Amino acid sequence: MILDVDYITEEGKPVIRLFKKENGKFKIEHDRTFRPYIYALLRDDSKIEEVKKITGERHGKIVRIVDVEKVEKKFLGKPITVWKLYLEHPQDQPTIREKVREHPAVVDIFEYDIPFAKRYLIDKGLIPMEGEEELKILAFAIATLYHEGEEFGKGPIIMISYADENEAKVITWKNIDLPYVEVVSSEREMIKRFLRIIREKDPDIIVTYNGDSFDFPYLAKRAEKLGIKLTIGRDGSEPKMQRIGDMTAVEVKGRIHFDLYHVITRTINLPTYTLEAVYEAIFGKPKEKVYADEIAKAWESGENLERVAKYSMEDAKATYELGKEFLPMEIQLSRLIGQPLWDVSRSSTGNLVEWFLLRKAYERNEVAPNKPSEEEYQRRLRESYTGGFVKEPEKGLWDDIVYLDFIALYPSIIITHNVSPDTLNLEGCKNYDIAPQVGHKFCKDIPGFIPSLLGHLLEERQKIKTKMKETQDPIEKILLDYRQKAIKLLANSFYGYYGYAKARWYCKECAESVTAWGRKYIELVWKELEEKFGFKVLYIDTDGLHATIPGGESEEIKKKALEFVKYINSKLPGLLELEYEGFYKRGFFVTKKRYAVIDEEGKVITRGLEIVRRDWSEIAKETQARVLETILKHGDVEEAVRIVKEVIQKLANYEIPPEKLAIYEQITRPLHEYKAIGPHVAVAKKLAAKGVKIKPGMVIGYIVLRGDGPISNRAILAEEYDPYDAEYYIENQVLPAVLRILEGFGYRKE
DNA sequence: GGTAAGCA
DNA sequence: TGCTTACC
């Protein structure tokens, strides 16, 4: 199977290399046959003989168009005649493009800034991570002797742990007596053993957690000072930093660096994204953290290292397990998109759709629209449309509730109303559907580019689901499940893609119309659910409704609910389908986007309320959860008021622990660009004053300390407490939190 | 990707 | 307001 691709300049000409892995043997495969090119649309096709002779320059030398062919393609469905300008080297494309645009007989030019190795994959129709191959995986993590004032790198690497399917060890240079620890002469020899372990194991994939930003760049700094070449690549080569977005990733030749941190952040939505937090949130069992302050003492003392070694071992072990679970999802995306895992694993869903289209656009002989210009991109940002409909809830406590939602609303709208730029407002098209409220016409004679592709996706997904039901072997059952999950992720990325400012196939009018149809079909079911079935729709948000027959018998509300979806689906066009999602014994609707329901088994789904927020104290979440609990389960509002008043005294007596006092707030900008200082900013601003590495995306916790003055300067880091203002955590957190529910019951501050 | 509730 | 985070 193909693991990666690249090119190298062999005496001025470009050579594609395919890093394969076939039946156990890893083998590089070269190719010199492939030619870089671009497209040029001419006003006068006779003026080709002039354009053929255009010439640029690069690093002193003179550059020209090696060849030219007249090809007929399509553009947004319509047939187009375009000339294919072949060059010699892919880095000639920037200079030639410029000079060809200037020409008056050239209208525009397309597919010019597509990386050369990616052309190869698309054009040759090759797909990474195909076929049956047992890839060797190896996770690893390091440990640094950090002091609070020290720069990045000055501290020695203390440990390097690595994990595997068979074993999981640690490598250090102090004397730790454990079966998994490996004692070594020095830092120098630690790094050396690591490199040997990598050569011995020979991993097809190297897994890490935060490798791109921390693990690898730290190694590099140390290996520089110790004069050691990090021979990690199969080419014998070192890890190379390669920019992909504004982000700077890390690359290893012949192997696949797989940083989990990127994939994780976009898959789930946890409070904090430390390795410890993520591990528990996936599997269940715990994993503690030993801080850099605690380890530095353990290094000087040299007696506490029994546990620090245990910590490092678990990081590698963790990373491997996490890695092992998140990989098949990511390798299936790579297989579906048709790009190397390394990129996919660091690629936004927007981009994933982009590349998916580019490939399919080739397969259909369609010329890809160009990226937006700087002005267009900016003019696209200052442009919007209305989104989903959200009903003001019928507030209060309600019995016997039902949830009904659409199966893949937006995909079904797209597919069945043929929504795409290549069908928008076509001239003299026979049949079309009009967009509600916004009035965009969509031709339905020939199925549009994107709609057509969603069809194939959902059809295949639909084929897998029926295959899973009917399959016997429980191995393929799991692999099927991953394919089907990947197609889902891609399938639901199209609506967002349409309004993505950097999108080649950006189509605001498409996005607007999908939304438009959404509201129509939801408001239909709404009016139809009450006026013809007697239900009372309590709340709505885009995709689904809550309903009930106020006072009615449980089993009747269910019986009629099933009947309503059986009737309404007959009224809905194409793929637009509604379903019976589930039943909830009670439900409490506070505001829009904020409510709680409780199933027949006793579990409570809380959405939007402080319970699931980061920027609220866990004492406020815990208290509020018990207030909800004691209202949803049964009317014990008497002890409910005692539950919260019991917490006021414990919070007053300083009897409540730390962590339950921590408030988390992400830093979304550079500290310089902040125009208004908050509490989480003032903490991270004074940390950076002591040389600490505060970057965007970093979620810090601030506990408020008892004093008097500004709320921001009184907040100290939550990671290290002071062995807090009781007025804040009561009157500005727990009380407001609990009030949100009890407000409807009429309670004041009591 | 738009809709929406909150804190000083 | 500036700001943050959740919802679909």
Numbering used by the authors: 1 to 723, 728 to 754
Reproduce, without paraphrasing, sentences from the article in which this PDB structure was first reported:
We had previously used polymerase evolution by short patch compartmentalised self-replication (spCSR) to discover variants of Pfu with a dramatically enhanced ability to incorporate Cy3- and Cy5-labelled dCTP and replicate Cy-dye labelled DNA. The resulting variant E10, derived from an exonuclease-deficient version of Pfu polymerase (with mutations V93Q, D141A and E143A) and with additional mutations in the conserved A- (V337I, E399D, N400D, R407I) and C- active site sequence motifs (Y546H) was able to efficiently PCR DNA while completely replacing all dCTP on both strands with cyanine labelled dCTP (Cy3-dCTP or Cy5-dCTP) giving rise to highly-fluorescent products, termed Cy-DNA with applications in advanced microscopy applications. In an attempt to better understand the molecular basis for the altered substrate specificity of Pfu E10 polymerase and generally gain a better structural understanding of the primer-template duplex recognition in this class of DNA polymerases, we have solved the crystal structures of the apo Pfu-E10 and a Pfu-E10:DNA binary complex at 2.4 Å and 2.9 Å resolution respectively and compare them to previously obtained structures.
The structure of the binary complex was solved at 2.9 Å resolution using the apo Pfu-E10 structure as the molecular replacement model. The Pfu-E10:DNA binary complex has three residues making minor-groove interactions: Tyr 495, Arg 613 and Lys 593. The largest difference involves the thumb domain, which has rotated by approximately 21 degrees from the base of the thumb to enclose the DNA and residue Leu 687 in the binary complex has moved 18 Å from its position in the apo form. In the RB6 structure the fingers domain closes inwards towards the dNTP, whereas in the Pfu-E10:DNA binary complex the fingers domain remains in the orientation observed in the structure of the apo enzyme, consistent with the absence of a bound dNTP at the active site.
